[PDB]
């Protein structure tokens, strides 16, 4: 089918170890979560500083 369907080469990747990508991404996610939580906490504090 002129390659319009089926396997599409690979994209121009950089090298990232498989078991390191898992780690780093997870860490990032955790950090994000923490940030959200931190924000919430700050908001709460603001509310009860009167």
């Amino acid at each position: 089918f002129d390659g319009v369907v089926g396997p599409y080469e690979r994209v121009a990747q950089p090298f990232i170890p498989r078991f390191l990508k898992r780690e780093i991404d997870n860490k990032r996610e955790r950090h994000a979560a923490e940030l959200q939580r931190a924000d919430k906490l700050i908001a709460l504090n603001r509310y009860i500083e009167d």
């Binding site: 089918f1 002129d2 319009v4 369907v5």
Partner: protein, 38 residues
């Protein structure tokens, strides 16, 4: 449910510019109900 899938020129409709087209997927009757706003 309408999935967007890349289709050959063989199965092209008169208009499709890109190979990319949206087409309907089938649904089980168990997952859809009758209307009549009901």
């Amino acid at each position: 449910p309408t999935k967007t899938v890349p289709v050959p020129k063989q199965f092209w409709l008169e208009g499709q510019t890109s190979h990319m087209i949206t087409i309907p997927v089938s649904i089980l009757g168990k997952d859809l109900r009758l209307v009549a706003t009901v």
